[PDB]
Design a binder for this molecule. Structure first.
Ligand SMILES: [Cu+2]
Ligand SMILES: [Cu+2]
Ligand SMILES: [Cu+2]
Ligand SMILES: [Cu+2]
Length: 505
């Protein structure tokens, strides 16, 4: 296999505005097919990238900054990855739309799956409204990320390389003196399988496919043979013996990571999807499902000269392989200090979500299930409703709801809601067989409150097998048409995604 830790970790450049004033910031981003070397020992790989880069440029904004991005498609008219034509029924083959994950965004700038567009906006989807997306950024400082969200193509377009980081800076958090600038580094983790000739491999079908299956055929899961960080296979990063802030983003299709340091050292988590935690949390390891973000501090002060592996213990379609997928990246504490470490690791970070005392307008019971198609494939469904079925999740603007998510399947699903960040209330185990046979919910244990990592704000949440997960969300400030879905992209595309109408009565 490819030799680990021979390439330096790239740090995506920060995107510069095309136009900027006090009143408005204007960006242009063009999707392009490009080649990049993903590892020292590989030929260059054909990829799809925002501004021709993989990952895309990091976008940095202030809270309340009036930001516009014209996302443009200048991609080839044919895909290089295998499209399954049977999962969705004169349309172009290549459709794209950019979703700012975690964005508090007006609905027509949110990247609705059916607001897609082909090259130069020549053809557009039925929900398309506008070329230039509007991000008012009227929300907490947080790690966001942007990726393709096109109907029935999300798993392919994202795997092709259409991902990037988007950071909201709240000037009020500057007094905390968290590590910043060069010492504040996004880590976008993507697992990939790469052929000897350097080309990306994505399966055309399940292994030993049933003759009943079409070709190509969507697969229920994808597990890459290699791990990349910031577009490089198993890279190393030279760090100062100093505190660093890392914005950890799982940008993988299916794979969940469970991260630790091979020297037994700790992380300090300061933030989740929705921004700073109320209190910092000392951690030895953490689980990171697709689309989850961890804002963490690693203190290298006492580890000068050392090589430390960011390790992974979570398997994907089997046990983790010590020589491959058990490795993420390597820190080398060999960079001379550029200046005094004046950064801090404060305990008191932000207001508790529990300070809020909103009235519960509605309690929604939702089940994770599905059916089988004419080809024998599993079709994963939220409430046994297809994407095209009439909308059922219709919260009222400005109201708070508790969503109770029932998972009677054998796997964890990272459930994601657009627009909002939410509070985690609790998880509680139930009798699966009883539920499957009768629909009766019979608990096999008491409710478990969230760990300290989930006491802040979340937008993507692990719904474990055989449990009921309860979350609470205030739906707003905008009304309109959004979505909610599992962020395992192979599930999202077929067909574990539903519309979500926030109404203004
Ligand atoms: Cu997302
Ligand atoms: Cu999202
Ligand atoms: Cu799923
Ligand atoms: Cu989404």
């Amino acid at each position: 296999t490819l030799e680990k830790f021979v390439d330096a970790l790239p740090i995506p450049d920060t995107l510069k505005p095309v136009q900027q004033s006090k009143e408005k910031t204007y960006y242009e981003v063009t999707m392009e097919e490009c080649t990049h070397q993903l590892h020292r020992d590989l030929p260059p790989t054909r990829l799809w990238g925002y501004n021709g880069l993989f990952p895309g440029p990091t976008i940095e904004v202030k809270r309340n900054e009036n930001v516009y991005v014209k996302w443009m498609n200048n991609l080839p008219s044919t895909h290089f990855l295998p499209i399954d034509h049977t999962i969705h029924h004169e349309e172009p083959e290549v459709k794209t739309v950019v979703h700012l994950h975690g964005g508090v965004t007006p609905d027509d700038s949110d990247g609705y799956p059916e607001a897609w567009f082909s090259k130069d906006f020549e053809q557009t989807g039925p929900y398309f409204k506008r070329e230039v997306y509007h991000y008012p950024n009227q929300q907490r400082g947080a790690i966001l990320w942007y990726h393709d969200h096109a109907m029935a193509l999300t798993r392919l377009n994202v795997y092709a390389g259409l991902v990037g980081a988007y950071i909201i800076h709240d000037p009020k958090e500057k007094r905390l003196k968290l590590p910043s600038d060069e010492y504040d580094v996004p880590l976008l983790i993507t697992d990939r399988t790469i052929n000897e000739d350097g080309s990306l491999f994505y399966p055309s079908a399940p292994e030993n496919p049933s003759p009943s299956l079409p070709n190509p055929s969507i697969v229920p899961a994808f597990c890459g043979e290699t791990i990349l960080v910031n577009g490089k296979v198993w890279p190393y990063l030279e760090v100062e013996p100093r505190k660093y802030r890392f914005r950890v983003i799982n940008a993988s299709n299916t794979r969940t990571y469970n991260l630790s340091l091979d020297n037994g050292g700790d992380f300090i988590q300061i933030g989740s999807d929705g921004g700073l935690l109320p209190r910092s949390v000392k951690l030895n390891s953490f689980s990171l499902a697709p689309a989850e973000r961890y804002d963490i501090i690693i203190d290298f002060t006492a580890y000068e000269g050392e090589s430390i592996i960011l390790a992974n213990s979570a398997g994907c379609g089997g046990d983790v392989n010590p020589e491959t997928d058990a490795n993420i990246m390597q820190f080398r504490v060999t960079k001379p200090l550029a200046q005094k470490d004046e950064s801090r690791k404060p305990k008191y970070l932000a207001s508790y979500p529990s300070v809020q005392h909103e009235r519960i307008q509605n309690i929604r019971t939702l089940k994770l299930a599905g059916t089988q198609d004419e080809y024998g494939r599993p079709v994963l469904l939220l409430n046994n409703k297809r994407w095209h079925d009439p909308v059922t999740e219709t919260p009222k603007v400005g109201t708070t709801e508790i969503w109770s998510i029932i998972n009677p399947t054998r796997g964890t699903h990272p459930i994601h809601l657009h627009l909002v960040s939410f509070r985690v209330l609790d998880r509680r185990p139930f009798d699966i067989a009883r539920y499957q046979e009768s629909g009766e919910l019979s608990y096999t244990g008491p409710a478990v409150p969230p760990p300290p990592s989930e006491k802040g704000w979340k937008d993507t949440i692990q719904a474990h097998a055989g449990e009921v997960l309860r979350i609470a969300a205030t739906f707003g400030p905008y009304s309109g048409r959004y979505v909610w879905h599992c962020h395992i992209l192979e599930h999202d595309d077929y067909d574990m995604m539903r519309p979500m109408d926030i109404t203004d009565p």
